[PDB]
Amino acid sequence: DLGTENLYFQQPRRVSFRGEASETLQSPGYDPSRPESFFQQSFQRLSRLGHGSYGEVFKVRSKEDGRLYAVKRSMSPFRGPKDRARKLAEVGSHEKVGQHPCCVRLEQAWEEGGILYLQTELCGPSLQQHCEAWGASLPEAQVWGYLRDTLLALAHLHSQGLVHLDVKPANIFLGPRGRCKLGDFGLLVELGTAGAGEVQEGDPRYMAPELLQGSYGTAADVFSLGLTILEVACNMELPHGGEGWQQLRQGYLPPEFTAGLSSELRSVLVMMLEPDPKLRATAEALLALPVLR
Ligand SMILES: CN1CCN(CCOc2cc(OC3CCOCC3)c3c(Nc4c(Cl)ccc5c4OCO5)ncnc3c2)CC1
Numbered sequence: 166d167l168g169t170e171n172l173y174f175q176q177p178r179r180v181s182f183r184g185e186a187s188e189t190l191q192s193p194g195y196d197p198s199r200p201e202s203f204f205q206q207s208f209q210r211l212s213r214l215g216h217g218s219y220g221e222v223f224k225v226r227s228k229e230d231g232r233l234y235a236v237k238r239s240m241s242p243f244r245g246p247k248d249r250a251r252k253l254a255e256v257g258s259h260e261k262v263g264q265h266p267c268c269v270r271l272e273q274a275w276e277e278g279g280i281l282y283l284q285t286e287l288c289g290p291s292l293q294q295h296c297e298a299w300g301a302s303l304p305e306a307q308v309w310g311y312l313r314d315t316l317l318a319l320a321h322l323h324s325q326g327l328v329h330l331d332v333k334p335a336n337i338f339l340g341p342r343g344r345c346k347l348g349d350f351g352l353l354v355e356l357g358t359a360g361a362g363e364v365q366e367g368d369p370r371y372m373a374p375e376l377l378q379g380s381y382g383t384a385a386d387v388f389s390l391g392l393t394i395l396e397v398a399c400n401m402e403l404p405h406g407g408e409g410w411q412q413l414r415q416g417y418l419p420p421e422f423t424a425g426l427s428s429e430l431r432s433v434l435v436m437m438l439e440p441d442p443k444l445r446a447t448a449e450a451l452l453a454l455p456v457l458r
């Protein structure tokens with residue numbers, strides 16, 4: 166596709182599949198004739214929230230409004246048109262999701278020097294970070310709300326034919342008094358549009374079993390959330406592979422870690438962890454249960 170096109174082998178510009186009034190960037194503190202990047206000139210860099218092969222996430226203060234944000238910056242200039250398209254897809258997916266109280270809000274995005282910058286609202290800690298700070302299983306009173314909020318997010322995605330494909334503790338973010346937002350939309354696919362195939366794999370700890378056979382559907386996210394909540398509620402490390410990975414995808418809940426679950430929460434997780442995606446409860450069906458209203 167892009168690989169056989171004459172797009173190979175070739176000044177900040179706004180990135181947006183919903184063109185706003187001009188794609189030239191401006192800000193207090195920014196002069197395009199100075200050599201520093203828009204990101205360097207237009208933000209106070211406060212701390213690094215994360216890093217990896219993808220690049221880095223920074224906590225920043227905007228010079229435009231003085232508010233705090235999270236900016237993700239890719240590691241190196243685009244390898245080529247397919248690499249560029251893959252990274253820009255995160256912006257498109259954020260815009261497909263749009264405004265929802267339980268989804269992370271995208272403020273703006275731009276490219277400069279082959280680097281993609283994604284500016285979102287700054288959220289509270291991820292569930293992974295919150296569990297690390299707690300040092301123990303999270304109380305079920307909290308967990309029920311995290312489950313409900315993230316199911317509301319998934320119901321929103323799934324109603325638009327979108328599959329997140331990488332739901333995990335590290336991209337569900339706390340908020341005000343115990344509300345959660347789902348973020349990290351880099352692997353999200355629009356069913357029927359991706360024609361893929363070329364779909365990347367999420368974290369193997371939370372991967373739905375049917376994805377091994379290439380059966381992609383909204384049900385995959387319900388399974389991933391099931392194991393996300395299992396991990397959070399039981400302080401249980403999940404296997405990347407091996408026999409334990411298989412057991413969790415055969416309807417098995419290890420007694421060593423899960424005996425402390427209430428029957429109510431266990432029963433909901435059993436619905437979400439159904440190995441057969443055709444029998445697995447939907448986000449909307451789970452939200453209709455009295456326990457989750
Ligand atoms: C010292 N701690 C004080 C509390 N503070 C809480 C807020 O932490 C975050 C962390 C984020 O990302 C890390 C979480 C786990 O994955 C690695 C990074 C946030 C985040 N990440 C993010 C992701 Cl995962 C994907 C795309 C993005 C992102 O920002 C902009 O575009 N986004 C928003 N808020 C975050 C708050 C931690 C430090």
